């Protein structure tokens, strides 16, 4: 499902680990409509843990697949997003999600 279209590679060796938190800044836009998932978190971008599925696959996968200081435009598919039952307005069914994520650091 998910694809990783990096823009800025990161160091290339430092990625999240099982037990670390990821600190990411992202833009979640839809194929051709708008932003639904954006992290314009005043003073604290989004964070989550790897192996606890607190995000969709596209992310656990996608972001795990990114290194510290790497930014990518990930394209996620139903299978890796909110499959079919999305939330009618934010994520209608079978909508592809696009996430311009920047892995800031691990916590």
């Amino acid at each position: 499902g998910v694809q990783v279209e990096t823009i800025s590679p990161g160091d290339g060796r430092t990625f999240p680990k099982r037990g670390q938190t990821c600190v990411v800044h992202y833009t979640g836009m839809l194929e051709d409509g708008k932003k639904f998932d954006s992290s314009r978190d005043r003073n604290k971008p989004f964070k989550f843990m790897l192996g606890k599925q607190e995000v969709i696959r596209g992310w656990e996968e996608g972001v795990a697949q990114m290194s510290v200081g790497q930014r990518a435009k990930l394209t996620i598919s139903p299978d890796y997003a909110y499959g079919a039952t999305g939330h009618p307005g934010i994520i209608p069914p079978h909508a592809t999600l696009v996430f311009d994520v920047e892995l800031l650091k691990l916590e």
Side-chain angles (χ1 to χ4, degrees), residues 4 7 13 39 46 104:
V4 185
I7 305 176
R13 298 160 296 118
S39 59
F46 185 74
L104 309 168

Side-chain angles (χ1 to χ4, degrees), residues 5-45:
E5 304 175 68
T6 307
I7 305 176
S8 204
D11 84 300
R13 298 160 296 118
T14 315
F15 301 69
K17 300 185 180 306
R18 297 166 45 121
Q20 297 280 157
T21 316
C22 304
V23 178
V24 304
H25 187 317
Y26 62 92
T27 314
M29 185 174 277
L30 309 169
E31 306 173 64
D32 61 355
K34 60 285 193 59
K35 48 169 186 55
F36 64 110
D37 241 301
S38 314
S39 59
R40 44 175 358 242
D41 311 78
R42 291 50 282 341
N43 301 297
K44 298 188 185 310

Side-chain angles (χ1 to χ4, degrees), residues 29-107:
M29 185 174 277
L30 309 169
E31 306 173 64
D32 61 355
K34 60 285 193 59
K35 48 169 186 55
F36 64 110
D37 241 301
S38 314
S39 59
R40 44 175 358 242
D41 311 78
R42 291 50 282 341
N43 301 297
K44 298 188 185 310
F46 185 74
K47 309 179 171 47
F48 62 102
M49 185 172 277
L50 176 57
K52 185 183 154 54
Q53 315 193 287
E54 311 183 298
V55 294
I56 47 166
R57 186 167 300 250
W59 267 50
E60 201 162 42
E61 167 70 279
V63 190
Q65 191 175 154
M66 292 177 66
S67 44
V68 173
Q70 181 167 299
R71 189 149 70 148
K73 181 195 79 293
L74 315 176
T75 302
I76 313 183
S77 45
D79 48 304
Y80 276 51
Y82 311 105
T85 323
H87 198 67
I90 321 186
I91 287 127
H94 305 72
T96 314
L97 307 186
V98 189
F99 280 84
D100 314 77
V101 192
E102 194 154 10
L103 174 58
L104 309 168
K105 184 182 158 298
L106 302 184
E107 220 153 81

